[PDB]
Amino acid sequence: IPPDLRPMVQLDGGRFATSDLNDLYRRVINRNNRLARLQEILAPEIIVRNEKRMLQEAVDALIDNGRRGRTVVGANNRALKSLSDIIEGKQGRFRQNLLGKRVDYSGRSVIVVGPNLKIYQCGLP
Amino acid sequence: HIIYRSEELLGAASNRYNITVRVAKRAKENRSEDFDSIDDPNMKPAIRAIIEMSDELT
Amino acid sequence: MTFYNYTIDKGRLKKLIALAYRRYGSARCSQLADELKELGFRF
Numbered sequence A: 001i002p003p004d005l006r007p008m009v010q011l012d013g014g015r016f017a018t019s020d021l022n023d024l025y026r027r028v029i030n031r032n033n034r035l036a037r038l039q040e041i042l043a044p045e046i047i048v049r050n051e052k053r054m055l056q057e058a059v060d061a062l063i064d065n066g067r068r069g070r071t072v073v074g075a076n077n078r079a080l081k082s083l084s085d086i087i088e089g090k091q092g093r094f095r096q097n098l099l100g101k102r103v104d105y106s107g108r109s110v111i112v113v114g115p116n117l118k119i120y121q122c123g124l125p
Numbered sequence B: 001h002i003i004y005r006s007e008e009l010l011g012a013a014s015n016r017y018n019i020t021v022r023v024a025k026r027a028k029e030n031r032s033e034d035f036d037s038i039d040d041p042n043m044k045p046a047i048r049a050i051i052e053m054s055d056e057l058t
Numbered sequence C: 001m002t003f004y005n006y007t008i009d010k011g012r013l014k015k016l017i018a019l020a021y022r023r024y025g026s027a028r029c030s031q032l033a034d035e036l037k038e039l040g041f042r043f
Helices: A020-038 A045-063 A093-097 B002-010 B019-033 B045-055 C010-023 C027-042
Strands: none
Touching: A020 A045, B002 B019, B002 B045, B002 C027, B019 B045, C010 C027
């Protein structure tokens, strides 16, 4: 994904506000560089078989977290946001950013009853 | 009397979604023709397109 | 014009609003409901 769709900003206290896509992308490359390291030094086959199984679980948790195996977590004990979990839910990209948007030139207030007026006329402060 | 002029325009037209495009396409001509220093605050170009279209309807 | 010589309820008011739509349209029907609520708020 492009990096602006996984933004990394810094807060006022100095901490960084990372996304869950950066933690799932890093699990793929860390297990892919280990597989290229084990295949170069002629590792035992019980370690290469276990490394390819974790590479299969890293991509599947990146695409749909919690579909086949167990749901991976991060620092907080909530579920990580995968690539598929941002489009299917009620808080996904379809039902919260495409079918319904927050508009400009808008506002709200409480309403009171206006008598001595007409229809097609409203009181505006 | 603007709401009485709009009900006469929507009637005898057979398509209420087509005669409102001709009002919106005439208000842009009245806005470009009113580019001089004289600007009437009471007669908007969107309101003047409804009065001029109802006078030619008869 | 007709003369309504009976006591007016809510259901008899909706027949008057529906009769003004069939004969006069929407502009005169909204003016009738605008004047009927000045009469109700006063009395």
